[PDB]
Amino acid sequence: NMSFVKETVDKLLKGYDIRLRPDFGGPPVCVGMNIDIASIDMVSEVNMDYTLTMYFQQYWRDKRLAYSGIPLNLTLDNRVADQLWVPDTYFLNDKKSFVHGVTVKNRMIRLHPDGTVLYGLRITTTAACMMDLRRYPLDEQNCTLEIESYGYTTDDIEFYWRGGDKAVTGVERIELPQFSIVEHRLVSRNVVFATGAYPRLSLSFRLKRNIGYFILQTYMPSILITILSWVSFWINYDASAARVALGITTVLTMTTINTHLRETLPKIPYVKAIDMYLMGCFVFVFLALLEYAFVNYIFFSQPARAAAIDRWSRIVFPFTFSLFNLVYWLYYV
Amino acid sequence: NMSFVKETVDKLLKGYDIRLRPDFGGPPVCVGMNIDIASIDMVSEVNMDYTLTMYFQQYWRDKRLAYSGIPLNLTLDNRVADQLWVPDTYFLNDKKSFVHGVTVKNRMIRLHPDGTVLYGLRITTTAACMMDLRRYPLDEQNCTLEIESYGYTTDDIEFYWRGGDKAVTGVERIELPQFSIVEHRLVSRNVVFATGAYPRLSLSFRLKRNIGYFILQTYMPSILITILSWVSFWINYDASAARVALGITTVLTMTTINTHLRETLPKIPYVKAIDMYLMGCFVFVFLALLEYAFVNYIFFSQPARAAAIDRWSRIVFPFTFSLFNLVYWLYYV
Amino acid sequence: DNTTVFTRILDRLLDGYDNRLRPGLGERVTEVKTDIFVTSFGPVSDHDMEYTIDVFFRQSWKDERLKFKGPMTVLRLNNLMASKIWTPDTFFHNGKKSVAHNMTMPNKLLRITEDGTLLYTMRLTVRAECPMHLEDFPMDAHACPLKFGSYAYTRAEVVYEWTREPARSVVVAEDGSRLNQYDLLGQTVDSGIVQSSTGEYVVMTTHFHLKRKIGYFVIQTYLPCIMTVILSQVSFWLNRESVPARTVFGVTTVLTMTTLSISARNSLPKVAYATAMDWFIAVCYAFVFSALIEFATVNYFTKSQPARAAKIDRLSRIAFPLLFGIFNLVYWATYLNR
Amino acid sequence: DNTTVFTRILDRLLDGYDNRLRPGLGERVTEVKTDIFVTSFGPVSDHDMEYTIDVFFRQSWKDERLKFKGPMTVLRLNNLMASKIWTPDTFFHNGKKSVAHNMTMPNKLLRITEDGTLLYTMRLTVRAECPMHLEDFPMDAHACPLKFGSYAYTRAEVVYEWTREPARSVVVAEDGSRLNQYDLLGQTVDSGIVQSSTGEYVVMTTHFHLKRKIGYFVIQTYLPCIMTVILSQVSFWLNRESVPARTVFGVTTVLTMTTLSISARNSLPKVAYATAMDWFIAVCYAFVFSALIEFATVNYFTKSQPARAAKIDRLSRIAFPLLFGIFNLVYWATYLNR
Amino acid sequence: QVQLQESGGGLVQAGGSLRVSCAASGRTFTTYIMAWFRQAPGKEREFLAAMDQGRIQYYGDSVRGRFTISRDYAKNSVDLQLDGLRPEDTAVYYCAAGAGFWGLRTASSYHYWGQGTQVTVSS
Amino acid sequence: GDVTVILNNLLEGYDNKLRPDIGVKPTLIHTDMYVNSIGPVNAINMEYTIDIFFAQTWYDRRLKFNSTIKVLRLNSNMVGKIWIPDTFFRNSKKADAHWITTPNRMLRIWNDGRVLYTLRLTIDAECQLQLHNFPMDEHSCPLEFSSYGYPREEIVYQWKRSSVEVGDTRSWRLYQFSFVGLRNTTEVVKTTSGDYVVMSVYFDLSRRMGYFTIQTYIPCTLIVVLSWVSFWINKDAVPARTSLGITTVLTMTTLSTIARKSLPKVSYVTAMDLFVSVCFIFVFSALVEYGTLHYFVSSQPARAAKMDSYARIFFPTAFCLFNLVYWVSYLYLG
Ligand SMILES: *[C@@H]1O[C@H](CO)[C@@H](O[C@@H]2O[C@H](CO)[C@@H](O[C@@H]3O[C@H](CO[C@H]4O[C@H](CO[C@H]5O[C@H](CO)[C@@H](O)[C@H](O)[C@@H]5O[C@H]5O[C@H](CO)[C@@H](O)[C@H](O)[C@@H]5O)[C@@H](O)[C@H](O[C@H]5O[C@H](CO)[C@@H](O)[C@H](O)[C@@H]5O)[C@@H]4O)[C@@H](O)[C@H](O[C@H]4O[C@H](CO)[C@@H](O)[C@H](O)[C@@H]4O[C@@H]4O[C@H](CO)[C@@H](O)[C@H](O)[C@@H]4O[C@@H]4O[C@H](CO)[C@@H](O)[C@H](O)[C@@H]4O)[C@@H]3O)[C@H](O)[C@H]2NC(C)=O)[C@H](O)[C@H]1NC(C)=O
Ligand SMILES: *[C@@H]1O[C@H](CO)[C@@H](O[C@@H]2O[C@H](CO)[C@@H](O[C@@H]3O[C@H](CO[C@H]4O[C@H](CO)[C@@H](O)[C@H](O[C@H]5O[C@H](CO)[C@@H](O)[C@H](O)[C@@H]5O)[C@@H]4O)[C@@H](O)[C@H](O[C@H]4O[C@H](CO)[C@@H](O)[C@H](O)[C@@H]4O)[C@@H]3O)[C@H](O)[C@H]2NC(C)=O)[C@H](O)[C@H]1NC(C)=O
Ligand SMILES: *[C@@H]1O[C@H](CO)[C@@H](O[C@@H]2O[C@H](CO)[C@@H](O)[C@H](O)[C@H]2NC(C)=O)[C@H](O)[C@H]1NC(C)=O
Ligand SMILES: CCCCCCCCCC
Ligand SMILES: CCCCCCCCCC
Ligand SMILES: CCCCCCCCCC
Ligand SMILES: [Cl-]
CATH class of the missing domain: 1.20.58.390 (Neurotransmitter-gated ion-channel transmembrane domain)
Incomplete structure (x- = not known):
């Protein structure tokens, strides 16, 4: 059973081209997003930013990775991610971010028989949000996180929240020493530039300071x-x-x-x-x-x-x- | 002249097994160590550590690298160290350390006709020592530095101070704004764990706070x-x-x-x-x-x-x- | 031929070996045995609610693909070769930014036995999260956890176990404690299950129990505050006619x-609620405030109703020491008994 | 069908290509078109004389060695292949440690057209030096520069130009201001030449004009200092027999x-010269010093020349407020204009 | 004030689901450990399950695989799903909250306790 | 064209593990330095920051070629393929090269074998400061570099015509200090592994006093007065004179606390510590003077009458004498 898996996996990566997106030249590839917030800390008024740790998942279907005969989801070594095509997702308001790497790089690749790819990362990021402190300390703040594709347009890639308003979890378990999270919101939209539209996802929180x-x-x-x-x-x-x-x-x-x-x-x-x-x-x-x-x-x-x-x-x-x-x-x- | 030296060096590194220690399967390889201390700074009571910069040198013999016909000590480019066997030395009480890399990696490899290897590194490290501050500011602290092999026992490698009590130099040229170095000491012993005896070299200072x-x-x-x-x-x-x-x-x-x-x-x-x-x-x-x-x-x-x-x-x-x-x-x- | 024998075994193990597949994939669950040795329990930061720990991390599992026969029974792998085989993807759930030491070389060791068992050790420094309840500051105690598990493999694929009894699988060095404001009492070792959006995972947990030392705050905050309140009540024994003396005394x-109040708040972190020290200072502030109000009442009734002015001063010499003494009895029984 | 034609182009471009040689080597001068979009003008650090800025950096040039023919008139190259061609070695002259973002992928894009025109875009966090003259603090204005050019190629090899009119080649987002204590008035875009020991180089310059906001310092420093000076002159209206009252008032x-003086200077950057705020406090300090000396003279001549002592107090009620008013008029008219 | 009120319970015919709840009021226990305990008649008080802030689930060695714990952090509550009940499971189930100092499996480390709820199993 | 052929043939048969003239004569290296800016001086850590352009020139016979092209102007791609000296800075605490947007390095080769190698560096260097005369102290902070592995028999350094250049000295990041001038020397230092040629540059710095006059010296003098x-x-106004x-x-x-906030915790007395402490003694003694005067009114009333007249003369005289000695020693005698 293990020898059959070894043969099947090597079959998929033979002839695989990393430089071409799934359904290249055809319909755009749809990517679904989930965020699992682990902790929010260091809300800095002087630096006007906050630090966020989360699990970031992306879902898309690639027909070149479809397999049959094995009724299992194949969790492969995380070093196989360099051998596949992944979206060029980035954070527009990110000042400093990194992927944790102890004891190994905190990355996951999982395959499904229909060709669905699950790609997970554990990321700590410092994101910049403007704070209006004229009413300090009786003030409310609204800090966001912006998700966009660096190179592609809506003719190539599309973004959506996977699960609707349930796509982001873990806010209800957050405790802030000086603030209290009042609400969080998910927005999906496209940005109409001169070269065409661009997909964007946005996640925002509203903070109320303690007195x-x-x-x-x-x-x-x-x-x-x-x-x-x-x-x-x-x-x-x-x-x-x-x-x-x-x-x-x-x-x-x-x-x-x-x-x-x-x-x-x-x-x-x-x-x-x-x-x-x-x-x-x-x-x-x-x-x-x-x-x-x-x-x-x-x-x-x-x-x-x-x-x-x-x-x-x-x-x-x-x-x-x-x-x-x-x-x-x-x-x- | 030059072509003869180039011929000899390529002969030494041809068919060289980096996974095998010198005298593999026989007597343990003896390693002599010298330290030249450049500076001591940031003796932190809050973090209970101190920072040290030094020239760390190791000295052993490998008959696989012996050459004849050239009455010279061959100083090679430091990138040749990646092609040779070196001891797996590490500092037990180290918290954070690095090797300087400007303008290149501060590393030295020197060969001798009898097969002796001189290996030098310029290291800045942060070492932790327990501090008893109940008599502050009339206190006296003792901070050490531990040197050990990570994966070898006394059957395969041995440590000694090269030069006796002269192995460590530069202590008398250290001027701390807050302390005076009363004494320094060198120890050499074998730690007896369950798996066997492990070599260890220890260097300690005694600091007396100024009043x-x-x-x-x-x-x-x-x-x-x-x-x-x-x-x-x-x-x-x-x-x-x-x-x-x-x-x-x-x-x-x-x-x-x-x-x-x-x-x-x-x-x-x-x-x-x-x-x-x-x-x-x-x-x-x-x-x-x-x-x-x-x-x-x-x-x-x-x-x-x-x-x-x-x-x-x-x-x-x-x-x-x-x-x-x-x-x-x-x-x- | 001993040197040639060792070389042959090294060059044969990784033939036909795929490191993208865990041992027993599609056949059984991979079992990983783990134990931890703590060399130093580093500083605890109350401001950032985090702590540092230095450990030796040991893991053990079985891989049948790496069996061999030879004169020896244990092999050590070069770190270039040790990156060619499958290893567990262990990570710390509450870690913030950890360091794997590589001075002067990577502090990793991987041993292979003939039956196929792998022993994998590494040296790490971990900065983890320890959320704290500071309502009882500075008479508070905390349990700082340390959780780790597999990032990608669910419990149907990889499970973790302690090498020995869970109590004896985490060992702290005799000189391990490196704490200036806490006292490390002990540790408890457990094991649980977490469910995420990707599946169910096995979590291994350790809790370190800390208790804060209070002697510093007694001599730095509590004693100076108690003496200042006692000083303000000394004013009741000065004669009423010494108006400038009692006004300068109170103010x-x-x-x-x-x-004193401004000095004390610097140590405390920025918390929303009121700690045990916040309440003590506020009561002391109200007591010295009330002593100056009392003299304003006495001075107002002097030279018109001397009998009432004398009566107010005599009762104040009893009520003020009594009420403050009563407050301390309640205060030091409510918090010292938690 | 179509993918094979698209893939064959990518495997054909780098046939006989040398990235160690610039385009038009020995035939022409390489020209680079540059434009910048400022996403956020980050913080300005007065203590370190530097500021942060987040920009999108775009460069355009023509390389005839990469011409191709096919249905797709524009090709975007992978980051692995994009590192195998020649790109300008632009660097910032006054730039300190800068960051090229790498999450979740390198934020770099390279496009090629059929004629060989290349477009190169990257996202950067530039930290650059801004020397400041704080003699007029807190009423100062500064112009922070941003200068970049080619490190290794002289102006006979590579020349830089703005993509559009120089004013329109640098764009700032409306929400891209992150300044707590500054107002961004505008920017100026320039080009020029610098001369070194290795040759002449083309340098592109941008200046951002800033004006510090003063309302914070008015309420925190100037108003409390003015009121304390006024209180010191209140003493001139108390009767001369009240020796303890006037002495305590003065000291x-x-x-x-x-x-107040210690607090005000503990927020400034540590400059060993005096600023405009240092001079204002020094004069305020000398005014309260002179008020206590005036009483020392009045108290001395009382009981010996009571007529003279009364005359000194009457004239001090006029001279002291008048001199302070004249000092403020000179101070504010001098510094606000400049 | 802080009160842990418990619901559910009753009687079941030696099987079936039985979801016992616990609602908190007067203090948010998001950063606390919420657990469940069991006390058979006159025998001893026994640890059953616990879930911390990170959603890590701990279970006793006797009820593992049968009882499932969960927390609704928005409503500040905790539930315990009892399945495959047996006559030996007849006891008083308790709800507790604490910081888990010196051990989350010991009852003497929980600040708040519920008033209990009798669960009877008939065979 | 043929430029690619030249590069390919040069690297053929090239061993970059061996320095030029390895068994014949020492390799001579000519160094230049352009100082972009000298950053803030950190007295607490005893360090300073400097940004420089660092250039090195030497001859390599293995890199000769013949063509109508005189010099091959190259970027940092070829730096790792040829031999480069292992120059490092001996008193550097932390140094790094610049990599935005590309590595800030350049390499030029002439047909006679001459190589020019330049790169941009930012350095945090150690400078031990003697603060006995603070805030009237002067310092010369060094910057030393040598070869890590090659002794004097293998590598020799030498300054060129224009050794150290400085541009806009007014644009630097020195607030506390003002730049005076620089010197450059050469020395041979004996270590445990051999004798090495060491090149040094010294920067002379004098501290400005405008801040400490307004903040410390004048306020302390006025309190004494x-x-x-x-x-x-x-003398009858007991509350007034006591308060x-x-x-x-x-x-x-x-005022005494804020005097030492700019210094490390050295245990010798600075010029500032002596002034503040003497001022504290003067105000301390003035209050003790009244306690003696007040007590003697009842005991020796005639003696108490003369005490205030003497204090009006002795106290201003002794403080003027101290200032005369203090400022003469620290401004004209050191
Ligand atoms: C303990 O472990 C740690 C690690 O945990 C270890 O430290 C690591 O050590 C390695 C070396 O062993 C370091 O790797 C080298 O880094 C060099 C540059 O370092 C600077 O930049 C680092 C980041 O790199 C980014 O930028 C460079 C360009 O500047 C780019 O090349 C990289 O790919 C990378 O860019 C990526 O990301 C950007 C976005 O950000 C993307 O846009 C981009 O597409 C890409 O994805 C940075 O990390 C460094 O900071 C570290 O180091 C400084 C000190 O230097 C320190 O102060 C910091 O604190 C920090 O530690 C630093 O800023 C890089 O040039 C090296 O690559 C060279 O060389 C290798 C080896 O030969 C070669 O394989 C490469 O191809 C490349 O070739 C060079 O390129 C030169 C460029 O100028 C050129 O001059 C040379 O000629 C050569 O060119 C080639 O030559 C070949 C052969 O002739 C030829 O065929 C080719 O055609 C071509 O001509 C190398 O990657 C690593 O950075 C260290 N990491 C850390 C965290 O320290 C430590 O040593 C260990 N200690 C012990 C004791 O064991
Ligand atoms: C913190 O601060 C940020 C910034 O202010 C807040 O983010 C904003 O939140 C609100 C509320 O969620 C957002 O409004 C909603 O937007 C969605 C998405 O619409 C987008 O996509 C549409 C296509 O799917 C597109 O048509 C939209 O563009 C239309 O509107 C613009 C307006 O200028 C117009 O120019 C276009 O021509 C289009 O007409 C847009 O790109 C939208 O679906 C929502 O519609 C709901 O509400 C409307 C009435 O307002 C109603 O008619 C609909 O039926 C529906 O019920 C709604 O408009 C807003 O977009 C966010 N801003 C940004 C920049 O993203 C954030 O909420 C704050 N935090 C917190 C915690 O509050
Ligand atoms: C820096 O070093 C150079 C090179 O040694 C010095 O210039 C030389 O000085 C010597 C005398 O010491 C003269 O004999 C040479 O003719 C000089 N060479 C020149 C001027 O090209 C230079 O003076 C040094 N800089 C100092 C000391 O500030
Ligand atoms: C005529 C009453 C005066 C009262 C005191 C006024 C003080 C003014 C200080 C400027
Ligand atoms: C130096 C202190 C002077 C104090 C006032 C003296 C007044 C003298 C009047 C004759
Ligand atoms: C102990 C210090 C006393 C200072 C005043 C003494 C006055 C009387 C001296 C005999
Ligand atoms: Cl400075």
């Missing part, structure tokens, strides 16, 4: 420092050393918060939503210390007017700070 | 801040604003020193000698501020008792801190 | 807590 | 400026 |  890390590290510390700056309004205005020290130390604490957040957050050199909130809090503590400058300057000549300014500051500052939050959160949530 | 960097950056700033906390003991206890500000600002300054060193020094998440000293200084400045709270609480009802505590604090705090330093600089130095 | 302990 | 603003 | 303000404050003294210590500590 729990930023609430306890960014927003809450800034809110509490602003509230502590209102303690000055309840201290007597003749306690100049107590109110000045309280006022100026809250300014330094707010500066310490902002500088260190810039050190830890990803370097995105344009105005985001997070920069507006920290700057807004800094203005409030700046004005609270500026309020005591007026009171201290007039509390001797006009002690009654200086007392009225402190009482109104106890109401205007908490009311205006909640008004700032209401406008900020409506415009960003 | 001058830490004296200026860590110990001296901590000592001087601790002394400033004693200044409050000579201030009148009725000056609460001065003594509170002095006490609490030294706590903030001590915290600033400790957190800056965390970002600057390598991340080694377990308790080292450097951590015990900084915590000891943080406790002392903590107790100095705690001393005034007791004095400020009783100085109205019991003025004589309050003044006695300050007088004794001027003695106990300087004396205990020096006793703390005496214990520290003996248990580690 | 500078808040800046000290902020400095 | 804490100095500490705040120190914190 | 600010601590002298306490000497003109009335001023301790806050300047905190400010100096913050």
